[PDB]
Write a protein that binds this ligand. Structure first.
Ligand code: HEM
Ligand code: HEM
Ligand code: HEM
Ligand code: HEM
Lengths: 146, 141, 141, 146
């Protein structure tokens, strides 16, 4: 996609307020709760028997920090998401075998989490900017699949 | 299917919307139009400017339909019968857009109900909107 | 949502397929893997090259479930119950993928039914596969 | 998008055999039969009440010719699909108010019609090549929406 200058600024401003580790565990937890089939990758992660357990699971939080950590970092290169994520792309395809649809589901769970976290600050135009970003990151992550 | 837990969670969460139903519907629509511009192709006849009477009005119609749905969650195909007919035979909105409005409805609820939007409730609401969407598209072909 | 005309059409088409159902199943998967590479993510334990016996074997199973569904086209959720469990809880195939294979099954049938694959039969087959897809994903959450 | 050299060659080869008028009418007709909500854009086209009526409708046939003509023309420009269809994209959004999801549906129906018409010759590799093409035309046609 293509963000207007104003849109990039809005994404950046909001993200400076984000506790990446907290939001990462929340988003990945929420994905495993809302779309349980996403748990398929985590048979070794421990207890996922309940929402609380999934949200409370330290391995989920642990991976959460890393996934949103890489997301956070990529926001520095909104102008080259393709390139920024090409190598995680190859990895997720060649070794992790993660259906790219998982990236879209996570992207939308993240938007809900930002909305829940920031409330009214997360205005319709701010969301519209972030939808471009999550679609952009998801696209970028799926681009090296083959 | 909507479990009993889903039904309790949705009634709880939407009950909280109460008299904001209109406002939230309108906001969900505005979020959709801005986030997903292709959806505006179904409303070429609307003033889609922020705060338009038309959007605020259609927002209330959508929310009230949802309140209806929640009220008769155990019997949604019947409760939404006229509306599913309307979408199937007249409006003919491609089914993919239901997921777009549904997502904007979730975002809206999340932004307004910090206390009520838990992971389990988020899940129930998502299933609920998906189920409403299914009813609304059930007669398309 | 399958009308008597749809059921008749499905039975006619799948009848013509007859003993080829298995071969067509494998062909549909091959079509899916080449047209929609992301689907290969669910088969890191298969050799996916053309002619692969694993794909042939999986194709036969897929085809057989469809034959079984056709035979129970009035009572599908139960006929496909074990498959719903398997997909929902073990395989955990993202639901978007069912549309891709359904499309590929359609293309495969089109390529093998010059006489039978009329617009009306095309419509019915598409609905039938959507229905099968719905049943297969109904237990996901 | 991004067809391999051999995918380009497969598309070109098959398309040499396509009766664009015949196929365009067949594909547009099947769109309206298989996804009847798509008839919402064709209120003036006359009789669409039954499948035989949709398929035999001269206005559906006529438009089919134009639509697949434009598709055919774009096959000469597989590297520049966005630029090729920018004008028609603006048309479909600003004047015709056509949900770009319709482009994806038509693309898939066109694939079914090619398979139906050509049988075994529409091999899985040739299908893959056409799938990239239709996804690309649909994307090109959606690009100027706003
Ligand atoms: C913005 C979206 C995502 C980003 C930026 C991302 C990025 C990453 C990163 C940085 C790693 C660590 C790799 C390493 O240490 O070499 C990783 C691993 C992994 N990811 Fe992703 N990911 C995303 C989405 C997802 C989703 C939605 C799923 C599944 C539902 C997933 C499944 C996995 C799995 C199973 C691993 C391996 C974890 C481990 O080995 O401990 N990813 N990802
Ligand atoms: C949960 C999903 C939805 C619900 C509950 C819903 C409900 C309603 C209701 C109650 C009406 C007015 C009925 C009447 O006045 O007789 C309506 C009309 C309409 N809806 Fe749907 N709807 C939904 C999804 C959608 C979507 C996704 C779209 C397009 C993106 C859409 C497009 C329209 C349009 C264009 C009208 C006519 C508006 C007018 O001319 O006033 N709807 N809907
Ligand atoms: C009409 C749609 C489908 C039908 C009827 C179907 C049916 C089946 C059947 C009968 C089996 C064998 C289960 C057994 O061992 O008894 C199976 C397994 C499996 N399916 Fe599905 N399936 C469908 C769609 C899909 C899709 C879309 C995907 C992924 C894109 C998928 C992925 C798998 C995988 C990975 C296995 C296990 C294969 C193995 O390890 O042998 N299926 N399915
Ligand atoms: C490959 C995809 C498509 C291409 C290349 C295409 C191209 C065209 C062309 C060349 C025209 C004629 C313009 C003229 O002669 O001035 C047209 C008109 C039109 N198209 Fe598309 N089209 C496509 C898909 C669709 C789809 C899927 C729909 C709806 C389901 C659609 C709806 C319309 C409508 C309503 C018109 C105006 C018809 C009239 O004159 O009354 N198009 N398009």
């Amino acid at each position: 996609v293509h963000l207007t200058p104003e849109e990039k600024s809005a994404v950046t401003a909001l993200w400076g307020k984000v506790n990446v580790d907290e939001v990462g565990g929340e988003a990945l937890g929420r994905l495993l709760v809302v779309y349980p089939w996403t748990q398929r990758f985590f048979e070794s992660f421990g207890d996922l028997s309940t929402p609380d357990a999934v949200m409370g699971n330290p391995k989920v939080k642990a991976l959460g920090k890393k996934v949103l950590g890489a997301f956070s970092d990529g926001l520095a290169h909104l102008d080259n998401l393709k390139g920024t994520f090409a190598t995680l792309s190859e990895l997720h395809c060649d070794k992790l075998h993660v259906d790219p649809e998982n990236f879209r589901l996570l992207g939308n769970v993240l938007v809900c989490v930002l909305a829940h976290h920031f409330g009214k600050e997360f205005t319709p135009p701010v969301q519209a900017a972030y939808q471009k970003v999550v679609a952009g990151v998801a696209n970028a992550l799926a681009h090296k699949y083959h | 299917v909507l479990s009993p837990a889903d039904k309790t969670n949705v009634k709880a969460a939407w009950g909280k919307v109460g008299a904001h139903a209109g406002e939230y519907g309108a906001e969900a629509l505005e979020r959709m139009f801005l986030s997903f511009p292709t959806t505006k192709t179904y409303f070429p006849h609307f003033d889609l400017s922020h705060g338009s009477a038309q959007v605020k009005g259609h927002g209330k119609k959508v929310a009230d339909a949802l309140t209806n749905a929640v009220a008769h969650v155990d019997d949604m195909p019947n409760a939404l019968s006229a509306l599913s007919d309307l979408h199937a035979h007249k409006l003919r909105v491609d089914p993919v857009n239901f997921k777009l409005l549904s997502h904007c409805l979730l975002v809206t609820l999340a932004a307004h109900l910090p206390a009520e939007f838990t992971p389990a409730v988020h899940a129930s609401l998502d299933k609920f909107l998906a189920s409403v969407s299914t009813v609304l598209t059930s007669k398309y072909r």
